[PDB]
């Protein structure tokens, strides 16, 4: 579970980054306002070292796993374009610091579909996964994902008069290794 208050993209073999197409480094991507990094880091900063560990040649998951194990304060060295060619190497110190989401509800229902909602939180989440299946059933769940900016989803193709269990998972990383405690409801169509 995140406590530095920013996201990263990039890494060798990763999904790339929105700043520099041909650079496989690690880049600060979104920064939580009023979070630990808010005065110090900005989108597009390339992380080259953290607590003495090189982030050159590192894979995405390796970077995430390293950053997550660091205790308390994290010293980062980043490269920032200022930037007509011009570059700065900046050393900063960032001090780390239920379910996600909360208040899962059905807003509207038809005999074969449900519109669900949950509380919008626009930071800390890479994407949501929504699962649904017959309550107590043994078949694999059906599922889909929605972006971090969503606080509603429509579930379609349901059987009328059947009990369903609906669960929402909020993943902090894009590769789906960490989710927060999920939230579920039961609903009968």
């Amino acid at each position: 579970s995140p406590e530095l208050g920013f996201s990263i993209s990039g890494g060798v073999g990763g999904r790339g980054n929105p700043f520099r197409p041909d650079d496989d480094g690690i880049f600060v991507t979104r920064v939580q306002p009023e979070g630990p990094a808010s005065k110090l880091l900005q989108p597009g900063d390339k992380i080259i070292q953290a607590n003495g560990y090189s982030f050159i040649n590192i894979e995405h998951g390796q970077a995430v796993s390293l950053l997550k194990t660091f205790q308390n304060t994290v010293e980062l060295i980043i490269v920032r374009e200022v930037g007509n060619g011009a570059k700065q190497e900046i050393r900063v110190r960032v001090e780390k610091d239920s379910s996600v989401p909360t208040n899962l509800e059905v807003v509207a229902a038809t005999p074969t579909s449900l519109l669900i909602s949950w509380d919008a939180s626009y930071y800390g989440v890479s994407y949501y996964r929504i699962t649904y299946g017959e309550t107590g059933g043994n078949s694999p769940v059906q599922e889909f994902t929605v972006p971090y900016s969503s606080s509603t989803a429509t579930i379609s193709g349901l059987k009328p008069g059947v009990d369903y269990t609906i669960t929402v998972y909020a993943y902090s990383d894009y590769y789906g290794s960490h989710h927060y405690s999920p939230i579920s409801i039961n609903y009968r169509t």
């Binding site: 995140p2 990263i8 929105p18 995430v64 989440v125 890479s126 972006p147």
Partner: peptide
């Protein structure tokens, strides 16, 4: 699109 970032 699918995300390309992870929170730390």
């Amino acid at each position: 699109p699918q995300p390309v970032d992870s929170w730390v």
